[PDB]
């Protein structure tokens, strides 16, 4: 309860950590920790009745977020870990179920069968791109095939529990918490041409309420980088 990092404080009360490992450290690298280890809270999305899902690219969403956006442009390489706090606040009269996954290397596929999706359609800088429950038409310029039941990666959406995940069931639970290490083939990689993670939120059992209750449940995603180190003189 009331954990603080740097000059920011959140409030909690179960945490699932990575693939079993805690994030730790390793020309020579420099290790900054004061101006990066803090809670960057993204703005809140609205979960309505006919919602489909959201996704963020993780070393892209904090690209304009304070001094962490300055270390992405001034330094060439770098490696980070993450600590993702998801919490949605609903009353006892609402119902639903979310699935919160953190997929490493989520290569997505274009709607046009010959091209690859362009840069603005894969990742929004601290703004969630959204799923659909239909198909996206092929004859357009360039967009992501974002049918939710195939998760945009050509794979059955029920089997997405093999990646490190956590359930948010509004009957019993309220929040999720993930701690993710650095998973890449090279020990230190570029932070502009590569997104090594992907945070997905998919409503399996959709929201329901009676007439009179508030028709939306806001979700709040709070990310804090752990054990970051860069490469420079």
């Amino acid at each position: 309860r009331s954990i603080t990092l740097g000059n920011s404080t959140i409030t909690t009360q179960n945490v699932v950590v990575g693939y079993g490992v805690w994030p730790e450290y390793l020309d020579q690298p420099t290790q900054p920790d004061v101006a990066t280890c803090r809670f960057y809270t993204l703005e809140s999305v609205q979960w309505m009745k006919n919602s489909a899902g959201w996704w963020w690219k993780l070393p892209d969403a904090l690209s304009q977020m304070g001094l962490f956006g300055q270390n992405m442009q001034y330094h060439y390489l770098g490696r980070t870990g993450y600590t993702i706090h998801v919490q949605c606040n609903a009353s006892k009269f609402h119902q639903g179920c979310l699935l919160v996954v953190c997929v490493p290397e989520a290569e997505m596929g274009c709607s046009n069968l010959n091209n690859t999706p362009e840069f603005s359609e894969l990742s929004g800088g601290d703004s969630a791109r959204m799923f659909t429950d239909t198909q996206v038409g092929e004859s357009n310029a360039k967009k992501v095939q974002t049918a939710v039941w195939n998760a945009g990666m050509g794979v059955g959406v029920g089997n997405l529990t093999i990646f490190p995940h956590q359930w948010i069931n509004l009957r019993t639970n309220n929040s999720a918490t993930l701690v993710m290490p650095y998973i890449n083939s090279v020990p230190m990689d570029n932070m502009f041409r590569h997104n090594n993670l992907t945070l997905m939120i998919i409503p399996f059992v959709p929201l329901n309420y009676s007439e009179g209750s508030s028709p939306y449940v806001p979700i709040t995603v709070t990310i804090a980088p752990m054990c970051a180190e860069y490469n420079g003189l």
């Binding site: 290397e105 596929g109 010959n114 195939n150 794979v155 029920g158 997405l160």
Partner: protein
Amino acid sequence: SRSESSIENFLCRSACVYYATYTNNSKKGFAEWVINTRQVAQLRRKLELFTYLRFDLELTFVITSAQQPSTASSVDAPVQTHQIMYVPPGGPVPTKVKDYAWQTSTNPSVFWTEGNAPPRMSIPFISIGNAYSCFYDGWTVYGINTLNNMGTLYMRHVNEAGQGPIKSTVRIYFKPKHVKAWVPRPPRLCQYEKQKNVNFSPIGVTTSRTDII
């Protein structure tokens, strides 16, 4: 009986990945294959369960001959000999049958006469990174990952024939060794559309039945 599901017993198998023809007289008969994992649709699905792999390689070639229709006058040929050149990542590339790139020094090539055991050879783990990457969410063009590039294979005759044409096929076999796998992923549901990327058309999750009961 739980040991046949180990990674060594699941991925160290042999598979026919390529099949090409080339003849000697036609001034452009030589084979070509960029070594990759996304060639045959079945081995691609067995390696797309994992994200990062790291294996050695062991290749075997089954080369056979076939006599093309010559003109006349009692054709009789000696035993043939083939050359299978391996180009490392970032090496010289041939374009014709008679070229400088065949006679180079840093490309290891095998020489093999017909009527013997097939010419095996083994390629080590060549990369700058610490593992191969079966998936890549990032730009180099989206989703290419120039770091796992294993090389190219080239085949040709080394006999010049004056009285009869001869064409030949070649079946390249593929066998990983000392495999290590990391970061397991869900198996692919949709069909494979292209070779380079992960494009698809959306299909239903499971084959349907009449009712819930």
